[PDB]
Design a protein around this motif. Sequence first.
Motif, PDB file in Angstrom:
ATOM      1  N   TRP A   1       1.418  -1.471   0.130  1.00 32.57           N
ATOM      2  CA  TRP A   1      -0.383  -0.187   0.073  1.00 32.57           C
ATOM      3  C   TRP A   1       0.984   0.959   0.120  1.00 32.57           C
TER       4      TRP A   1
ATOM      5  N   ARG B   1       2.411   1.557  -3.855  1.00 34.91           N
ATOM      6  CA  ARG B   1       1.714   2.553  -4.270  1.00 34.91           C
ATOM      7  C   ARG B   1       1.908   3.561  -4.693  1.00 34.91           C
TER       8      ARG B   1
ATOM      9  N   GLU C   1      -4.270  27.224   7.060  1.00 36.38           N
ATOM     10  CA  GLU C   1      -3.395  26.909   8.025  1.00 36.38           C
ATOM     11  C   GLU C   1      -2.903  25.546   8.384  1.00 36.38           C
ATOM     12  N   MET C   2      -3.888  24.749   7.793  1.00 34.16           N
ATOM     13  CA  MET C   2      -3.678  23.142   7.481  1.00 34.16           C
ATOM     14  C   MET C   2      -1.763  23.314   6.935  1.00 34.16           C
TER      15      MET C   2
ATOM     16  N   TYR D   1       0.388  24.396   9.304  1.00 36.83           N
ATOM     17  CA  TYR D   1       0.791  23.508  10.554  1.00 36.83           C
ATOM     18  C   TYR D   1       2.048  22.991   9.797  1.00 36.83           C
TER      19      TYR D   1
ATOM     20  N   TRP E   1       5.257  23.998   9.420  1.00 40.22           N
ATOM     21  CA  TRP E   1       5.754  23.847  10.832  1.00 40.22           C
ATOM     22  C   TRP E   1       6.097  23.020  11.348  1.00 40.22           C
TER      23      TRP E   1
ATOM     24  N   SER F   1      -7.843   5.178   2.701  1.00 40.27           N
ATOM     25  CA  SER F   1      -6.284   4.493   3.155  1.00 40.27           C
ATOM     26  C   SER F   1      -7.030   3.307   2.195  1.00 40.27           C
TER      27      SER F   1
ATOM     28  N   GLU G   1       4.063  29.225  19.947  1.00 35.76           N
ATOM     29  CA  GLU G   1       3.807  28.191  18.166  1.00 35.76           C
ATOM     30  C   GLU G   1       2.851  27.382  18.693  1.00 35.76           C
TER      31      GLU G   1
ATOM     32  N   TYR H   1      -1.143  26.744  18.410  1.00 31.70           N
ATOM     33  CA  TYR H   1      -1.079  24.762  17.332  1.00 31.70           C
ATOM     34  C   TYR H   1      -2.693  24.060  18.535  1.00 31.70           C
TER      35      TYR H   1
ATOM     36  N   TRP I   1      -5.884  26.168  18.248  1.00 25.84           N
ATOM     37  CA  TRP I   1      -6.311  25.785  16.862  1.00 25.84           C
ATOM     38  C   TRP I   1      -7.080  24.210  16.668  1.00 25.84           C
TER      39      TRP I   1
END
Lengths: 254, 254
Positions: free
Chosen positions: A144, A147, A229-230, A233, A236, B17, B229, B233, B236
């Motif tokens: 998994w 691929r 924002e993600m 994240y 960071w 997944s 920071e 986090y 958020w």
Amino acid sequence: IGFDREMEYIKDYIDPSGVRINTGIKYHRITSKSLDASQKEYYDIDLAMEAVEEHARDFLHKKESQARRLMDIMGVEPVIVAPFDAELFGHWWFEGVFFLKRFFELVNESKDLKLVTASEVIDTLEEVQIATPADSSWGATNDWIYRHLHEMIERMIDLSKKYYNSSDPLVERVLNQMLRELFLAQSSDWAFIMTTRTSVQYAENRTKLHIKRFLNLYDQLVSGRIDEEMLRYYEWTDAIFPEINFRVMARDVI
Amino acid sequence: IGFDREMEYIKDYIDPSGVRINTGIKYHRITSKSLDASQKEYYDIDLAMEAVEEHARDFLHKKESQARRLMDIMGVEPVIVAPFDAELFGHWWFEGVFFLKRFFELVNESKDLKLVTASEVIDTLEEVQIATPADSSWGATNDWIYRHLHEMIERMIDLSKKYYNSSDPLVERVLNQMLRELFLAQSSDWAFIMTTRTSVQYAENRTKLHIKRFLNLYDQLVSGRIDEEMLRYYEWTDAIFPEINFRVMARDVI
């Protein structure tokens, strides 16, 4: 002492979870080949130094012997290439750097032997043969992951070419973090690692974590909904090559 | 269909997944008491409606019967209090809200019965007895979690009193997120939950995650090294009560 010292004594030097771990202060010597670890005697650093002195002369005598034999068979100076994992010296083996230092000083005195760096040798050698090395390594389902790696590389290349000439600094930040995520998922460490107390667990968890982060960014990009924002994240937590440029992936090959 | 439809068909409606999960589109009726789930027949929504019509009149007749018996024994109007988990209607039981609607309409027509809200009854009742309720609930190691909860509450109270009169908006942000973390760790859901496909796993992982976040902030505060920071986090990801004020924890009790 994190396994030996009493719990109330040792509490805020182990894990905040309360689980016993290594502290770095250790008092026993290996002692013997016994499977009974409780029978271990206390470390004496002077005997330990006597051991490094012996070992360093053992190794010296072995390299001098090997050098002389090789000079006589070759007719030019051998270069004996001996690579080790760094942590073997000082970490797995506490006295390792002491050994390294004594071995250097001994080689320095030796009339049979010289320490060289690799760039000294390429700068000095006049006869060198030309050859092509064979495929090789210094070497030692679950697909998994594969691929997904396949699709991530294929997609990464597409997008790097597609946005080669973009000047949008948001798309660029996104593509730059995708590449980091992809590279982070490639770490050999997470695959057939040199993980000490690692266990194929934090590792395949690492890989999948970076795969997932990459796919999240891929999805936001491909659909207009970059989530800033993600992205910040990710920038960071996975901050590895700040200077990277996703455009490395758009270059020719072959 | 996420378990039945072919994998290539169904791929991007299940988990990224690749693992099979529920989609929300379901075609079978319960059919029988068989343990052989493969023998299940296709859902017919008209028969299903015939069932709700029957059940809703069953329940109606049971409540009318109970009302009449109670009026006759009591001499005042009974208030029959019947609380349910909301997801039982429409989620566990697909036809539940249809049932709710038919039962309301039936009660509306009933000459034995009235729907009331709870605030209507407190606003209407003239005779009510005074009583003190007994300790109770509607009720149904692992104590590393408990001593941590104990210390977090005790520490939270100390600090809320200690910084009661602070005007430092960083300390305040920190204390405010500590309380969120503490509250988040208190969720009964993570303890003896009403978790459907939950399993004491994501749950105790939840609890410990919030415990750890709280201790991180506690440590930064107590030592001058607030890490802005990390705090952002936490603000958020654990964003629950934006308007909270840690000073709630400094009030008197008893």
